[PDB]
Amino acid sequence: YQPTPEDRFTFGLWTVGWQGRDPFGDATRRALDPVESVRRLAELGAHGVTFHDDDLIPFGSSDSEREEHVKRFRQALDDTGMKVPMATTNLFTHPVFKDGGFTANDRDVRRYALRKTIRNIDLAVELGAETYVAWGGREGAESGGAKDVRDALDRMKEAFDLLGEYVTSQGYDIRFAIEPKPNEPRGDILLPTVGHALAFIERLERPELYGVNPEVGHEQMAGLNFPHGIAQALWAGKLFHIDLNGQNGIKYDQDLRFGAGDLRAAFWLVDLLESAGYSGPRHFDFKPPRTEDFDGVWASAAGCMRNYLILKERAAAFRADPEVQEALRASRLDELARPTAADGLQALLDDRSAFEEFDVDAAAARGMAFERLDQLAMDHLLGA
Amino acid sequence: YQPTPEDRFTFGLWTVGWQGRDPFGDATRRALDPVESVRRLAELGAHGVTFHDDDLIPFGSSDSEREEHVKRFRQALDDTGMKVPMATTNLFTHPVFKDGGFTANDRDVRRYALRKTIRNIDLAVELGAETYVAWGGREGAESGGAKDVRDALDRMKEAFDLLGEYVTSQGYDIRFAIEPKPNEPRGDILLPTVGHALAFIERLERPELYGVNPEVGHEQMAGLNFPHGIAQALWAGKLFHIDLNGQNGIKYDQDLRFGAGDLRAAFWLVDLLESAGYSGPRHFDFKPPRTEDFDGVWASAAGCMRNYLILKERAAAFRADPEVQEALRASRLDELARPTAADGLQALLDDRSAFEEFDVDAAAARGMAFERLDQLAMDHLLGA
Amino acid sequence: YQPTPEDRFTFGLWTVGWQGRDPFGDATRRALDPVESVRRLAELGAHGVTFHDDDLIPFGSSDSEREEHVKRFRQALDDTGMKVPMATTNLFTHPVFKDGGFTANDRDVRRYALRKTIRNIDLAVELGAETYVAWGGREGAESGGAKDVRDALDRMKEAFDLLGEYVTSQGYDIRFAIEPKPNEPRGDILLPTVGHALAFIERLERPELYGVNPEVGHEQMAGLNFPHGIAQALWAGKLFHIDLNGQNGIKYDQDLRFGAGDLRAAFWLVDLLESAGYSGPRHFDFKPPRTEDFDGVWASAAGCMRNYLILKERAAAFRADPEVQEALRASRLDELARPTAADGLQALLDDRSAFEEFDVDAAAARGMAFERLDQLAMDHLLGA
Amino acid sequence: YQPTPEDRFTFGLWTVGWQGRDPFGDATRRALDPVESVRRLAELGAHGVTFHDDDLIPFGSSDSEREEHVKRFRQALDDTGMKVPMATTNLFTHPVFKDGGFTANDRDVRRYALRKTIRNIDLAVELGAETYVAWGGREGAESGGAKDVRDALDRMKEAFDLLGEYVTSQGYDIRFAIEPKPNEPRGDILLPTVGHALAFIERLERPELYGVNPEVGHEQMAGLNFPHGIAQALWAGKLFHIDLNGQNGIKYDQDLRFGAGDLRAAFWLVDLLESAGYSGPRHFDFKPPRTEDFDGVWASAAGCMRNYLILKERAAAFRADPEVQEALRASRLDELARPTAADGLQALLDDRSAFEEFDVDAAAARGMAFERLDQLAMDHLLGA
Ligand SMILES: [Mn+2]
Ligand SMILES: [Mn+2]
Ligand SMILES: [Mn+2]
Ligand SMILES: [Mn+2]
Ligand SMILES: [Mn+2]
Ligand SMILES: [Mn+2]
Ligand SMILES: [Mn+2]
Ligand SMILES: [Mn+2]
């Protein structure tokens, strides 16, 4: 279960580099030089790294400091063969963003948020990133009067439309991936789920330039089924990036290593990504727990990839097993894939087998055989 | 706080008529004749009633029994002046629907589900309903292998497209309202939130014929902010119906009377409906608790309307209060409503006040004054 | 992974016998004769069965009907070698219990609830049960004024005290196991968690006669860690029975087969039961999903036991692995087991190594190595 | 609704003094001098302040710095008439506590945690505090192997027993109040609810010296009913302190001002505290949102007290209303307060009205009238 380049595993600088600050505790680890993280991740078999502007370039850097940080980072990438497939903006840490970036009530803040973003899109392109994530962690409210959501969605559409105009005007080959989250750090976050973000994208001027960046933990913070949401994103053709991690139910954002948390959901997610032929990077947005020293940081990172690969093997074995294929037919998964009424509406209307002569009791007596199927899936997951 | 016809309060037959069966208990009340419910609701000041096919016409009725049930119902409506603004299909109670209606794995069931629906659309039109709700409570799964969600969404789009074709071919003035719910009775339900349903609608052949029917409790079962979801539905122009009730957090679907549950969310919801000028019926999908006899049934129903009207008065007083209007300006809600960059992208790019000369620390020092605003809102809610 | 008698797997009649009624759907399966369930469970390798009074004897039976039902059941038990280790009362299904049994506001109902219980304790003893469960599913409220909880806890203590007096007066070798649940079917249930039930027991007249009957799903409906709660029950010496099943987070009570739901929690639970030497039956309180016919019922039951046995093997392999034993020392689990201050208070107070000479920064630098440990646990669980 | 000294409202230094650091954001406010917070709180009508050791004395202070900080604080208290009813230890912020204080796996850390605590108990007594809170926010785990909970509970009992020995040996008039929380900052926290803490206390050597310090938000993070848990604490005689704030459901610990969050639960809590005659301080453990400047800090604090007083008036009006008193009898709350069987077990056993002649159907027909009662409560809450 040793990772390879084709596996395309990627990590945020802010993941392994998380110093361990939490709402109730100080840092437990020293800051990492992004150069060291690139080296260490490459040695573990990662394919690439991602960044927030402020992870790579200290906030408020001069042009000359900016240049030197980027230079050093590029040398590490060249030294290791690591790629930079995705970048994003930090529009959440600095106090100025306490009520939002793109949907701050203060118009001057909204404009500043756009200018910060646009500066880093230029950098992202310079580094070869083809995806630009946006997680509006500060867009939202703690109280009902603080944020008129219709006006906020107008400001959010305005901002993304301006960004689409900018990338189009520059001829850039980059697309955006909007990351939902239901809450934390705001009491409620705008675009709280995969669904709300998919729906919002359809109202943008250039919808083709935007997709979702769903995160395992975030949908689970709403008690939603993350494989189901990914399936809807896939169905819509909007899965432009994914964040992989673990989460134990409805609570604060834990960002556990991938595999931890809801293990059966991790299994079904890998099954779906691999079955659908998803071609994007398998990106980890996780935090080694603050209990850990650097050895545990690298162990946690390695474990992300290991778990993905173990689940990939098990899901593959599940789908290739003739007994599972038989069970899937027994449960009528083949029938679900066939059109209800390719014969068309009139034919349906005139088909007495769909109504007057439909034997409801005979149909109702038919078992779905879902338990046997799911125990086959469990046996495969556990290698039993 | 006495309801009037213009208030347009409506109730499902299945609401006050709920006999009190729950997962662990038998009925506590006798079945109600829909005629009696129409009479009683009218006496309380309701404007109309809604129905599932199977609430009005016992499942498996002959044509002559069908005719007589509808006749009796129409006499009660004519006797009282009650309207029937909305109808829907029961695609969840009968065993044949145990794996779904429109997304059942069995194709014969999917066709039967469409034919059942289409029959009741004809009835709904005969009774004057302009909205046709669809709550796919059985669409989903308990286990991961049981339901391929991409195939299920294909079958779901197929079904709604056929229904759109049918209403178009008949020249009917009816529109559909899809009701999300995250779970219960399936382990996970497809289209689990307002967002997922909005997104799904945009993929239908005739999107203009479909909106959402969000329910207070259902979004709350995912710990989501129901006023926020309604705001997004409004923003999209897709709020075609609403279900009002109460829910105490993330747990089974309680369907408490409106006002109960999250009271502050009820306040903010009423504020939003009234401020936006929502013109649809204020429909209650609630269940008088099984502890109650018929006197308590009618008390619970009355309480739905009373709470709506008390919250309407308080929200109106909040928005009309010059001190609140001052607080809203202090918190920059006026600024949120103004375009970020009506000057356009280039102007933004060339505006040094948005970047080089933006004083982040001065901006960050500015308080949002949201606490004073929210205590004004609380004072208004409580009449303090 | 074939079950044996020493495995002591037991099932409620109401588990495999669940006809599939849910809040939104009719039964999907016919009623099972308890005789058939005993036969079928024995063929799968179960050790015994448990019952509610009303599962074995239809409510309202005459003495002669009572005798004949018990006779038939006893013949099946004798035919199969199945045991009856536990019984309980149905104080939740009949309408009379809509506000509770022991804590109903109506005193006449409370007395009736006690008499119903006492009748079935006599039967339980006749059948050899040594544990008598009590799940007060109707004890609680939907609204705040309906139930004064201090008075309710007085009535609850009164009832259990009377039951303790009764078993003592009869010389019966039976102990009680109180089953917490946070909600459903009441909006909030009294004694909502393992903790609240442990605390309540300590106030009873004869605390030694009462323990907890925790259920996996029930603690998870509060987002609690079920292995942690079991550990506290074990620590207190109060784990008198356990209910095993699966649950996918904070939602309605799903009662999935054991292993389903939170798989990693199932692993840690089995590890704890086996490591602690728990000697009670491994009882399943689960419901085969209503999608299933009888073949799927028996498959689901078999799967409960299979998953328990697969997890037992993996946990055993984890604890026996010298590499895990090394990791556990690396993480200082050995140190957690040693007294903080067996030297006593004064010695602690006078120990400069505990304060003036304690190097906080050196201590803080020490990693806990928990990630490596947990990846060893994951590898063992998955057989990787 | 102006607060008075008899109202006994108290605040933690760390509440109004919270600088606004969250998991995703830097401080938005400068640090407050505890002297200024004492002055400002007194001007708002608070009765007193509480502290963690590290809120009053910077961690690592010399004896002379310690003395000067305490001196300044005592002058402000004397200047204002403010009291210090409660103190506590910070055993969560410093890295050394990343795996716990009293239940850290490292024994040297456990001893250090005890010595830190004991030092501040001496200070607490010097300042007149009669209650000493303990919130073990770091006691727990993110993974299953990291923490053997039985061993941890042994270490936790050891620590509290040593503290009880210490206060007894010194002749101090101080009692402990253990604060449960279900999670955050650990994945699961030991003693996660009021119930688990009540149960744990009963196993200590000197149980009379320990009670609970329940926090509104914390029980709500488990979706529990906070008034119910308080009622059980009251019933047990163990409510030694309370933390008041707001929380919007199952999510991260929000610490909103009291009244915010679940308003109806705030109503029922105040009703219960006032009806039971609770005599402890009404302590607020809340955080003004980081959106706010200092004006909003003081507004938020004022709002805590205002909401408590508005709810007190409404609850009082509810209980004094003859119509409510009539409704409470109609719902049989009087009967719930009367013994089930003061006649004793034998009498119960011989009472044919409790069994053979109990008319279940007549009893079951009786409505509980809970909806009318709850609408009276709602009308009172809203002043309608
Ligand atoms: Mn996250
Ligand atoms: Mn992410
Ligand atoms: Mn509902
Ligand atoms: Mn509804
Ligand atoms: Mn259950
Ligand atoms: Mn159970
Ligand atoms: Mn808190
Ligand atoms: Mn607290």
Coordinates of N, CA, C and O in Angstrom, one line a residue, chain D residues 113-200:
Chain D
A113 N -0.4 18.9 37.2 CA -1.8 19.4 37.1 C -2.4 19.6 38.5 O -3.0 20.6 38.8
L114 N -2.2 18.6 39.4 CA -2.7 18.7 40.8 C -2.0 19.8 41.5 O -2.7 20.6 42.3
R115 N -0.7 20.0 41.4 CA 0.0 21.1 42.1 C -0.5 22.4 41.6 O -0.6 23.4 42.5
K116 N -0.7 22.6 40.3 CA -1.2 23.9 39.8 C -2.6 24.2 40.4 O -2.9 25.3 40.7
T117 N -3.5 23.2 40.4 CA -4.8 23.3 41.0 C -4.7 23.7 42.4 O -5.4 24.7 42.9
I118 N -3.9 23.0 43.2 CA -3.9 23.2 44.7 C -3.4 24.7 45.0 O -4.0 25.4 45.8
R119 N -2.4 25.2 44.3 CA -2.0 26.5 44.4 C -3.1 27.5 44.2 O -3.2 28.5 44.9
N120 N -3.9 27.3 43.2 CA -5.0 28.2 42.9 C -6.2 28.0 43.9 O -7.0 29.0 44.1
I121 N -6.4 26.9 44.4 CA -7.4 26.7 45.5 C -7.1 27.6 46.7 O -7.9 28.3 47.2
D122 N -5.8 27.6 47.1 CA -5.4 28.6 48.1 C -5.7 30.0 47.8 O -6.2 30.8 48.6
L123 N -5.4 30.4 46.5 CA -5.8 31.8 46.1 C -7.3 32.0 46.1 O -7.8 33.1 46.5
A124 N -8.1 31.0 45.6 CA -9.5 31.2 45.6 C -10.1 31.4 47.0 O -10.9 32.3 47.1
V125 N -9.6 30.6 47.9 CA -10.0 30.8 49.3 C -9.6 32.2 49.8 O -10.5 32.9 50.5
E126 N -8.4 32.7 49.5 CA -7.9 34.0 49.9 C -8.9 35.1 49.4 O -9.1 36.1 50.1
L127 N -9.4 34.9 48.2 CA -10.4 35.9 47.6 C -11.8 35.6 48.0 O -12.7 36.4 47.6
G128 N -12.1 34.6 48.8 CA -13.5 34.4 49.3 C -14.4 33.5 48.4 O -15.6 33.4 48.7
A129 N -13.8 32.9 47.4 CA -14.6 31.9 46.6 C -15.0 30.7 47.4 O -14.2 30.1 48.0
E130 N -16.3 30.4 47.3 CA -16.8 29.2 47.9 C -17.0 28.0 47.0 O -17.3 26.9 47.4
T131 N -16.8 28.2 45.7 CA -17.0 27.1 44.7 C -15.7 27.1 43.8 O -15.2 28.2 43.5
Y132 N -15.2 25.9 43.5 CA -14.1 25.7 42.7 C -14.4 24.8 41.6 O -14.7 23.6 41.7
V133 N -14.5 25.4 40.4 CA -14.9 24.6 39.2 C -13.8 23.8 38.6 O -12.6 24.3 38.6
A134 N -14.1 22.7 38.0 CA -13.1 22.0 37.2 C -13.7 21.6 35.9 O -14.6 20.7 35.9
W135 N -13.2 22.1 34.8 CA -13.6 21.7 33.5 C -12.4 21.0 32.8 O -11.4 21.7 32.5
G136 N -12.5 19.7 32.8 CA -11.4 18.9 32.2 C -11.5 18.9 30.7 O -11.8 17.8 30.1
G137 N -11.3 20.0 30.0 CA -11.4 20.1 28.6 C -10.4 19.3 27.8 O -10.8 18.9 26.6
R138 N -9.3 18.9 28.3 CA -8.3 18.1 27.6 C -8.4 16.6 28.0 O -7.6 15.8 27.5
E139 N -9.3 16.2 28.9 CA -9.4 14.8 29.3 C -10.2 14.0 28.3 O -11.4 14.3 28.2
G140 N -9.6 13.1 27.6 CA -10.3 12.4 26.5 C -9.4 12.0 25.4 O -8.2 11.6 25.7
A141 N -9.9 11.9 24.2 CA -9.1 11.3 23.1 C -9.7 11.7 21.8 O -10.9 12.0 21.7
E142 N -8.9 11.6 20.8 CA -9.3 11.6 19.4 C -9.4 10.1 18.8 O -10.0 10.0 17.7
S143 N -8.7 9.2 19.4 CA -8.7 7.8 18.8 C -8.9 6.8 20.0 O -8.6 7.1 21.2
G144 N -9.3 5.6 19.6 CA -9.7 4.7 20.6 C -8.6 4.0 21.5 O -8.8 3.8 22.6
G145 N -7.4 3.8 20.9 CA -6.3 3.3 21.6 C -5.5 4.2 22.5 O -4.8 3.7 23.4
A146 N -5.8 5.5 22.4 CA -5.0 6.5 23.1 C -5.3 6.6 24.5 O -4.5 7.1 25.3
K147 N -6.5 6.2 24.9 CA -7.0 6.5 26.3 C -7.8 5.3 26.8 O -8.9 5.0 26.2
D148 N -7.3 4.6 27.8 CA -8.0 3.5 28.4 C -9.0 4.2 29.4 O -8.5 4.8 30.4
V149 N -10.3 4.2 29.1 CA -11.1 5.1 29.9 C -11.3 4.6 31.4 O -11.5 5.4 32.3
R150 N -11.3 3.3 31.6 CA -11.3 2.8 33.0 C -10.1 3.3 33.8 O -10.2 3.8 34.9
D151 N -8.9 3.2 33.2 CA -7.7 3.7 33.8 C -7.8 5.2 34.0 O -7.5 5.8 35.0
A152 N -8.4 5.9 33.0 CA -8.5 7.4 33.1 C -9.5 7.8 34.2 O -9.2 8.7 34.9
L153 N -10.6 7.0 34.4 CA -11.5 7.3 35.5 C -10.9 7.0 36.8 O -11.1 7.8 37.8
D154 N -10.0 6.0 36.9 CA -9.3 5.8 38.1 C -8.4 7.0 38.5 O -8.4 7.5 39.6
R155 N -7.7 7.5 37.5 CA -6.8 8.7 37.7 C -7.6 10.0 38.0 O -7.2 10.8 38.8
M156 N -8.8 10.0 37.4 CA -9.6 11.2 37.7 C -10.2 11.1 39.1 O -10.2 12.2 39.8
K157 N -10.6 10.0 39.5 CA -11.1 9.8 40.9 C -9.9 10.0 41.9 O -10.1 10.7 42.9
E158 N -8.7 9.5 41.6 CA -7.5 9.8 42.4 C -7.3 11.3 42.6 O -7.1 11.8 43.7
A159 N -7.3 12.0 41.5 CA -7.1 13.5 41.6 C -8.1 14.2 42.4 O -7.8 15.0 43.3
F160 N -9.4 13.9 42.1 CA -10.4 14.6 42.9 C -10.4 14.2 44.3 O -10.7 15.1 45.2
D161 N -10.1 13.0 44.6 CA -9.9 12.5 46.0 C -8.8 13.3 46.7 O -9.0 13.7 47.9
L162 N -7.7 13.4 46.1 CA -6.6 14.2 46.6 C -6.9 15.6 46.9 O -6.6 16.2 47.9
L163 N -7.8 16.2 46.0 CA -8.2 17.6 46.2 C -9.1 17.7 47.4 O -9.0 18.7 48.1
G164 N -10.0 16.7 47.6 CA -10.9 16.7 48.7 C -10.1 16.5 50.0 O -10.5 17.2 51.0
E165 N -9.1 15.7 49.9 CA -8.2 15.5 51.1 C -7.6 16.8 51.4 O -7.4 17.2 52.6
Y166 N -7.1 17.6 50.4 CA -6.4 18.8 50.6 C -7.3 19.9 51.3 O -7.0 20.5 52.3
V167 N -8.6 20.0 50.7 CA -9.4 21.1 51.2 C -9.8 20.7 52.7 O -9.9 21.6 53.5
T168 N -10.0 19.4 52.9 CA -10.4 18.9 54.3 C -9.3 19.2 55.3 O -9.5 19.8 56.3
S169 N -8.0 18.9 54.8 CA -6.9 19.1 55.7 C -6.6 20.6 56.1 O -6.1 20.9 57.2
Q170 N -7.0 21.5 55.2 CA -6.8 22.9 55.4 C -8.0 23.6 56.1 O -7.9 24.7 56.4
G171 N -9.1 22.9 56.3 CA -10.3 23.4 56.9 C -11.0 24.4 56.0 O -11.7 25.3 56.5
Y172 N -10.9 24.2 54.7 CA -11.4 25.2 53.8 C -12.9 25.0 53.5 O -13.4 23.9 53.5
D173 N -13.7 26.1 53.4 CA -15.0 26.1 53.1 C -15.1 26.4 51.6 O -15.4 27.5 51.1
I174 N -14.9 25.3 50.9 CA -15.0 25.4 49.4 C -15.4 24.0 49.0 O -15.2 23.0 49.6
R175 N -16.2 24.0 47.9 CA -16.7 22.8 47.3 C -16.4 22.8 45.9 O -16.2 23.9 45.3
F176 N -16.3 21.6 45.3 CA -16.0 21.5 43.8 C -17.2 21.4 43.0 O -18.2 20.8 43.4
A177 N -17.1 21.9 41.7 CA -18.2 21.7 40.8 C -17.6 21.3 39.4 O -16.8 22.0 38.8
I178 N -17.8 20.0 39.1 CA -17.3 19.4 37.9 C -18.1 19.8 36.7 O -19.4 19.5 36.7
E179 N -17.5 20.2 35.6 CA -18.2 20.8 34.4 C -18.1 19.7 33.3 O -17.0 19.5 32.7
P180 N -19.2 19.1 32.9 CA -19.2 18.2 31.8 C -19.2 19.0 30.5 O -19.6 20.2 30.4
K181 N -18.6 18.3 29.5 CA -18.7 18.8 28.1 C -18.5 17.6 27.2 O -17.7 16.7 27.5
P182 N -19.3 17.5 26.1 CA -19.2 16.2 25.4 C -17.9 16.0 24.5 O -17.4 15.0 24.3
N183 N -17.5 17.2 23.9 CA -16.4 17.2 23.0 C -15.9 18.6 22.9 O -16.6 19.6 23.3
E184 N -14.7 18.8 22.3 CA -14.2 20.1 21.9 C -13.5 20.8 23.2 O -14.2 21.3 24.1
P185 N -12.2 20.7 23.3 CA -11.2 20.5 22.2 C -10.8 19.0 22.0 O -10.3 18.8 21.0
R186 N -11.2 18.1 22.8 CA -10.8 16.7 22.5 C -11.9 16.1 21.6 O -13.1 16.6 21.7
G187 N -11.6 15.1 20.8 CA -12.7 14.4 20.0 C -13.9 13.9 20.8 O -15.0 14.1 20.4
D188 N -13.6 13.3 22.0 CA -14.6 13.0 23.0 C -13.9 13.4 24.3 O -12.8 13.0 24.6
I189 N -14.7 14.1 25.2 CA -14.3 14.5 26.5 C -14.8 13.5 27.5 O -16.0 13.0 27.4
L190 N -14.0 13.1 28.5 CA -14.5 12.3 29.6 C -15.5 13.1 30.5 O -15.3 14.3 30.7
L191 N -16.5 12.4 31.0 CA -17.6 12.9 31.7 C -18.4 13.9 30.8 O -18.4 15.1 31.0
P192 N -19.0 13.3 29.7 CA -19.4 14.2 28.7 C -20.7 14.9 28.9 O -21.1 15.9 28.2
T193 N -21.5 14.5 29.9 CA -22.8 15.1 30.2 C -23.0 15.3 31.7 O -22.2 14.6 32.5
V194 N -24.0 16.0 32.1 CA -24.4 16.1 33.5 C -24.5 14.7 34.2 O -24.1 14.6 35.3
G195 N -25.2 13.8 33.5 CA -25.4 12.5 34.0 C -24.1 11.7 34.3 O -23.9 11.2 35.4
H196 N -23.1 11.8 33.4 CA -21.8 11.1 33.6 C -21.1 11.7 34.8 O -20.4 10.9 35.6
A197 N -21.1 13.0 35.0 CA -20.5 13.6 36.1 C -21.2 13.4 37.4 O -20.5 13.1 38.3
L198 N -22.5 13.4 37.4 CA -23.2 13.0 38.6 C -22.8 11.6 39.1 O -22.6 11.3 40.3
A199 N -22.7 10.7 38.2 CA -22.4 9.3 38.4 C -21.0 9.1 38.9 O -20.8 8.4 39.9
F200 N -20.1 9.9 38.3 CA -18.7 9.8 38.7 C -18.6 10.3 40.2 O -17.8 9.7 41.0

